[PDB]
Each structure stands twice: as C-alpha cells, then as structure tokens.
Amino acid sequence: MPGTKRFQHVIETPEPGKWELSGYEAAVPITEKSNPLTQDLDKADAENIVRLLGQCDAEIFQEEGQSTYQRLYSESILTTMVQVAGKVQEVLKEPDGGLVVLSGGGTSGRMAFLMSVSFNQLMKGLGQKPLYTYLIAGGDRSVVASREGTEDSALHGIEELKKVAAGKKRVIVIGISVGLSAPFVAGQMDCCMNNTAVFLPVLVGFNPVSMARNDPIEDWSSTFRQVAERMQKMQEKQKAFVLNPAIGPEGLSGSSRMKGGSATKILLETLLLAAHKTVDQGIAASQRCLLEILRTFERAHQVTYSQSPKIATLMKSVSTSLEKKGHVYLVGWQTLGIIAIMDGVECIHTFGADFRDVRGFLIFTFSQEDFLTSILPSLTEIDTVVFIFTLDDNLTEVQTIVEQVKEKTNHIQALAHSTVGQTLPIPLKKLFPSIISITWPLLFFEYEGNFIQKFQRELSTKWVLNTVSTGAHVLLGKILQNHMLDLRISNSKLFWRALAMLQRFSGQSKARCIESLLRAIHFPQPLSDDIRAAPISCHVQVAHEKEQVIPIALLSLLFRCSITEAQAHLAAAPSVCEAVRSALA
Ligand SMILES: Nc1ccc(S(=O)(=O)N2CCN(c3ccc(C(O)(C(F)(F)F)C(F)(F)F)cc3)CC2)cn1
Ligand SMILES: O=P(O)(O)OC[C@@H](O)[C@@H](O)[C@H](O)[C@@H](O)CO
C-alpha cells in the first residue's frame, strides 16, 4: 500500500513477553540496543551514574566470550589492525601523491579531525609533509557545530571525498560510522571500491556487518550493508578492510558519541601510531606493538575512573546550575579545549539543550583577555566553570582566569593532567580545594610531542566530560530508563529511533506507531497518501522544526486518542516528563 516499501525494513512489534522469541531483539544492532547495566539509569544517583557509565566504557576492552561477536582484543580484529597499519606504511614509504583520509558524520567526524591533526603534527615533528586529512558531514563547520541532518546524503560524501582526493595516486579512506549507518560514509566506501587502482577503503564501526544498516538511502542505490558485505569479500584480496569490533551498547541507548567515539580513537590512534613508529624501525607492525598501545589505553580507563567521587561531584554541580537556569563553561587549552567544545555542542542534539547550557572554550576559540572582557561579565552565583589543562600548559594564563572567575562565581571544580611529581604552582592553588587530579605514570616515547601522552589525556578528558554532561541531564529527569524519548528528529536514523521507541513503550502495532508519528509530525495536516509514501527526508525536514513530536505521538497511542487530544493533555500536565511517565504508569 501507500508507504509499504518506505517502512518494509521495520520489524513488527512483538507481543507482550515475546521480544526475544519473535527475534525482533536479535535484529536490533548492538549500537542501538538498551544496555542492561543501565536499565534504571534514570533512578541512579550521581555516584551510581559514574559507576554505571564507567562500567559501560569498560566494555570496550572486554574480551570475546567462548559462540559470539568479535571484540577489540580478538585475533581477527587485531590481525585486521595489523594489515591496515601495513597499507598505511606503503603510503608513508611513498608520500608523493599519497593521502590518508579519515571521514565520518557527527562525532565520527569530530574524532576524524582530532586524529588527522595529531598524525599531521607527528609528521611535521619529523619534517615530513602532512599526509592526513579529515572529512566531516556538512564541511568543516560541522567539527564544532550541531548539524545532525548533514549525514543523509551519499553524493555529498562522494563530493567531499572527490575534492580532497585531487590528483592523488594512492588514497586511504577510513570511513568511520559507529552504527555502520551513515549514508555520507557509504557512498565514499562504494566509490573507493569502484576505483581500487587509487583508493583503499577501510570501514570502521562497531556492529557486525550482519547488523549494518539496510534501509534505502535516498540518493543512492545500495545500502550500507551491501557496501560493507562487499568490502568484507575484498578483504581476502586485501583491497578493503572492515574493522568492526563489538563494544556493547551505549549506557544511553544509541548515544554513539560516547563509547563509539571513544573506541574510534582507541582503535585508530593505536594502529596509526603503530604504523608510524614501526616504519622508522624498519620492522612490520605486529600484534605485539598494537597490544602495548591498547593496554595503555585500557590503563587510561582505570586511571580515569579511580577519580570517580570527584567526577560525581562535578556532575552534581553541573546538574544544579542547569536545574536553576545557569550555564556551564568548559574552559580548556589546546586539544582538550576543543574536546570541551565538542562535548558542549553535542548536548544540544543529545539532550535538546541550548548552546549556553554546556558550552566549551579553547585558549569558541577565545583569547585570555577576550574571555575576561566578553564572557566573564555574564557569569553568576549559580553557574559552574570547569578548567581543563595539563601542567605543561601556561599556568600563568590559567591562574589569572580562575582568579577572575572565582570572584563572579564560586562553583569552579577543575581537571588537571600531570606526569608524576609535577607539583602545581601556588600551594595556595586552593583556588581549587579537591581538584580532579589525574596523574600519569612515566612511559617510553620516542616521538616528538609525546603522542601517546596526548592520546591518553584527550581520551580521559572525553570520558570525564561525556559522563559529566550526560549524568547532569539524567539527574534532571530528562531520560526515560536509558532512552532519550524526547529527541529531535533531524536525520533518518533519528526518525527510525523514534519509531522504535514508540513501539517499545506503547507495545502497539507497527502500523499504529507509524501513524501516530506521521500525524504528530505533520499535524495540523491529516495523513494523505502522498504523506504516507513520502521519502523519510520529508518527515525529517518537518519534524526537525517541532517540539515534543515524540512524546505527543506516544500519548496519542497510550490514550488511544487524537493529536488534538494529546497536545491538549500535554499542555495541561506540569511537564513533558511527568505527562509521559504518568501516562506510561
Ligand atoms: N546499523 C543500523 C543502524 C541504524 C539503523 S536504523 O536507523 O534503521 N534504526 C535505528 C534505531 N533502531 C532501534 C533503536 C532502538 C530500539 C529499542 O527498541 C531498544 F530498546 F532496543 F533501544 C528502543 F527501545 F529504543 F526503541 C530498537 C531499534 C533500529 C534501526 C539500522 N541499522
Ligand atoms: O558514527 P555513526 O553511527 O555514523 O553516527 C554518526 C552521528 O550520527 C553520531 O556521531 C551522532 O551525531 C551523535 O550525536 C551520536 O551520539
């Protein structure tokens, strides 16, 4: 009928109690699943939250069980990492007309960028011409902006890839898509496979290829799945690679900026860094070289989360300022500044939060006085300001800005990375009572700017800020179990996530859920046959513009009532969250 093929991939809602037996749950990609550790995340207190997310993040390093999915430390994955290091080496050997592209949408795009800078530094440090570049969905703008809608075009991905691949002779394209989902990457990988002579595609994400996305893409004929299955066949001739360890679901379902983006760095820093370091040695990269690095990253988690109580406290101070109407400033230097910006921006689409709510800053890119003059006066009793640096930074720029802020505000916890026995000027730097002191062992490093210390630190900061930003909002009651129900539908993936949440929470048929959603989106216009049959991009473009789409749609279903009736109920309840939870009751 009208809309049958648009919605064909959607599995029917199972009956009460048979979610397993129907096998609907077997087809939910690992990346979208509900993480059982966080079933009650919306009841956890701050310290619980930090523990549950610490646990979730730990799952990245968990090893393979005895009929089950390959993981980071499984031999197949490390062997693929080794082969890829190899191919990166051939390019490094012969940089003339060589290029290495790291590409993704959203947080995969952000991760791509950091890493292309890092490995560009590393080659500058050795006086080699930089061979790395990034590509992000929607151009460079996207690195530091919330722009969730730009991932949905395969021709845009191919366009962007054709720009930077110029008249290069040998190009490595690392397509990063956590969910093995983004149309932006799918076209790139497919294009590479059509010109092997020049391109080598390497696909990175965290689902088995059997769970790769498989609904049609509006500007492209193949699906992500087909593209990935065909890359996997090519791997046997070593002309494509798929690097896809399971890392377990996200503690907030489908919030792939968290574990997904973490594991992206872990996986890609590790392997690239191996390729470089072993290329100067005239040795092949080996599982043993990768393992040293992976184990360092695994220590980095333990190191990071041992500071848990201070993490729960910072969370509680971020949650408080938001619970009033304050604002949160993440102030950090060099790449940890960026990471802070990245975190704050991602809270907009992730939690429906305003850009002032949690906002990052680098010394978005403001100077010492500049921040003192412009941003400083706007601060207030109820806010929180977070400072993020190493002892190697310029603590005379640091101490100044804190002095200033300690006046206009008092909540000013802070995040300081140190190699052991660095001290921390001003013993009267009880400007911060009990800092988040993270001190790193000494470790070997032959390269110039100590790249492995950078990677550790960036990851540990990412983990802290993510757990913080995410916990603060959970505490405010905005998360339903371990799902963000009331999200903004701004891309096709988010539209499927919405439809999925409608089925799960209502228990009602696929057809009713779809109808309640489309009515909610297009109200006041009734359901027509054109609307039923529209490409999903038409629903997205209309929903993106509205508020409470999903909660309205869910109420209409639970109450078995019209959109006019559910909007009126909603507006009569004290709050969205209360309207929904009590309707669910
Ligand atoms: N690899 C991929 C990635 C995305 C897609 S998708 O965009 O078509 N869609 C994403 C959301 N998705 C989904 C999300 C959440 C659920 C849930 O059922 C649960 F519990 F599993 F999270 C929820 F309750 F959230 F709805 C179920 C399915 C199914 C597939 C398909 N394959
Ligand atoms: O890497 P994927 O699966 O292609 O996801 C790409 C982006 O949608 C994703 O990074 C998203 O922006 C984040 O808000 C998810 O928390």
Swiss-Prot record:
It comes from Homo sapiens. This is Glucokinase regulatory protein. Pfam families: GKRP-like_C, GKRP_SIS_2, GKRP_SIS_N. Found in liver and pancreas. Not detected in muscle, brain, heart, thymus, intestine, uterus, adipose tissue, kidney, adrenal, lung or spleen. The gene is GCKR. Beta-D-fructose 1-phosphate binds at residues 107-108, 151, 177-179, 346, 493. It is found in: Cytoplasm; Nucleus; Mitochondrion. Beta-D-fructose 6-phosphate binds at residues 107-108, 177-179, 493. Disulfide bonds: none annotated. InterPro entries: GKRP_SIS_2, Glucokinase_regulatory_CS, MURQ/GCKR, SIS_dom, SIS_dom_sf. Residues 88-284, 318-478 form the SIS domain.
